[PDB]
Design a protein around this motif. Sequence first.
Motif, mmCIF file in Angstrom:
data_model
loop_
_atom_site.group_PDB
_atom_site.id
_atom_site.type_symbol
_atom_site.label_atom_id
_atom_site.label_comp_id
_atom_site.label_asym_id
_atom_site.label_seq_id
_atom_site.Cartn_x
_atom_site.Cartn_y
_atom_site.Cartn_z
ATOM 1 N N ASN A 1 47.520 37.595 34.500
ATOM 2 C CA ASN A 1 46.191 37.033 34.246
ATOM 3 C C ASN A 1 45.709 36.191 35.421
ATOM 4 O O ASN A 1 44.966 35.220 35.258
ATOM 5 C CB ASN A 1 46.182 36.217 32.955
ATOM 6 N N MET A 2 46.135 36.569 36.615
ATOM 7 C CA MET A 2 45.676 35.915 37.825
ATOM 8 C C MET A 2 44.430 36.609 38.339
ATOM 9 O O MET A 2 44.367 37.838 38.401
ATOM 10 C CB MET A 2 46.744 35.980 38.904
ATOM 11 N N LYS A 3 43.449 35.825 38.754
ATOM 12 C CA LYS A 3 42.268 36.400 39.370
ATOM 13 C C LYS A 3 42.539 36.430 40.857
ATOM 14 O O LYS A 3 42.537 35.388 41.517
ATOM 15 C CB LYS A 3 41.017 35.578 39.092
ATOM 16 N N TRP A 4 42.799 37.608 41.381
ATOM 17 C CA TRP A 4 42.823 37.757 42.815
ATOM 18 C C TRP A 4 41.563 38.394 43.344
ATOM 19 O O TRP A 4 41.401 38.491 44.563
ATOM 20 C CB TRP A 4 44.043 38.564 43.226
ATOM 21 N N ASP A 5 40.656 38.796 42.464
ATOM 22 C CA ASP A 5 39.472 39.528 42.874
ATOM 23 C C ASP A 5 38.659 38.779 43.918
ATOM 24 O O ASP A 5 38.684 39.125 45.103
ATOM 25 C CB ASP A 5 38.628 39.795 41.642
ATOM 26 N N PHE A 6 37.993 37.709 43.498
ATOM 27 C CA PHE A 6 36.982 37.022 44.289
ATOM 28 C C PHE A 6 37.444 36.714 45.696
ATOM 29 O O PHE A 6 36.610 36.518 46.581
ATOM 30 C CB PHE A 6 36.631 35.733 43.586
ATOM 31 N N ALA A 7 38.753 36.622 45.909
ATOM 32 C CA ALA A 7 39.283 36.389 47.239
ATOM 33 C C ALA A 7 38.639 37.281 48.282
ATOM 34 O O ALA A 7 38.247 36.788 49.344
ATOM 35 C CB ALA A 7 40.788 36.623 47.237
#
Lengths: 233, 243
Positions: A216-222
């Motif tokens: 459930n980690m958001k790595w997208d916006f990176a």
Amino acid sequence: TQQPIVTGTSVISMKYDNGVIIAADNLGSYGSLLRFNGVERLIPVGDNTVVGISGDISDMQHIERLLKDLVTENAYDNPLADAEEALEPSYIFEYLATVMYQRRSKMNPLWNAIIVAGVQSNGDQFLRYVNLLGVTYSSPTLATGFGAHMANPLLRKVVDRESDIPKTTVQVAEEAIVNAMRVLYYRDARSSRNFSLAIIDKNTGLTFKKNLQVENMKWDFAKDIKGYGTQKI
Amino acid sequence: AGYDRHITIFSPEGRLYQVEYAFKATNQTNINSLAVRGKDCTVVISQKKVPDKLLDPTTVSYIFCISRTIGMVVNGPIPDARNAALRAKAEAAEFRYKYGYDMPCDVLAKRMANLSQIYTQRAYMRPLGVILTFVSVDEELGPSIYKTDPAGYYVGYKATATGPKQQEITTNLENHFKKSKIDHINEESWEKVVEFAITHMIDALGTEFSKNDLEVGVATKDKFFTLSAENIEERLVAIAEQD
């Protein structure tokens, strides 16, 4: 006299209404090398008791071996070593805490920070911490180190105080744990995505969990972040 | 005393003759040139005059690409020409370096504007006899035309020309703009804007231009640039098609 060498990451825990919850990674760390994901920092002793340990593994390794002995010792000449004369999270902690302070006070500390996850013989959540300084304290939530900085807030945001605990289910906290696990696994170089968790419940007793992977980690916006700054491409 | 003309000091009239004479050096090159903001673009056209064979004519431009975004045309001597662009060159990256975003066109102008006023006020400093027009399509201001003088005086333009015959194209565009009533040439293809220009340059100069005749450049969004003789030729061809 010692220093961390083979090192276990932070340990986090809190007691819920019906029991306690604790998790630590499966990793253990040697310098910047995260050397062993085969490192279980959560140590169950009996049903009522599990032990989180951070810092020196060899210490912890040493430590843990000392613990079974206690059982085997508490076993000796003890029919009820299973019954009420079984070991108690309080006792074990109490026993242990003596050691560290001494070891400290011996100027030969054991290099570790340690929470004793327990739920007492009367079913009382035993959550109490001990450091390699041998200073101990107990509190609705106990996270260590990196976790103690980030997770305790989360879990203090979970339970601000004692009255919160009887309101605090397993899963509500348990969730935040794994969340904190992710949180820690977010912001720590040492934090592991794979981890383990334990829950002593006044009822279910020990509930231990393995190989729990931070999710459930958001790595997208990176992807949206270009250079450190005014670089526009 | 009479040095007041030799130097920059207020004339009895409070006038600066070197300045006024620097103005002479401006068309002393005798290059007529224009700056037209297209709708999208800004376009700048100028006389490419190749007096000699021994020249490498390619080497000849008074239109200078200042930045990524900003170019400039120079009206004035190529030493002084080559100077200010250099001078300009610094500020951009400088500004950008300092300010994290590229210098807006006029800023350079205002900047470069400051410069002569110094020399204007700085006696031993001589001001430069070049007239400079900066153009870009500004992230803020879009198409942009900023001409500066040897006097550090400057302003924005709906468009402009410059050279000995400046007034003529000036009239022409002034005619055409008072006609067209909008600050910019309204064309999406800068080509047309160019073609419009080369027309109205050919128009007011009454002068047909080869592709070797024209110093041609286009300020476009994020990129100022110029054309080869062939886009020019294309303009020569394209403009030959409207007429």
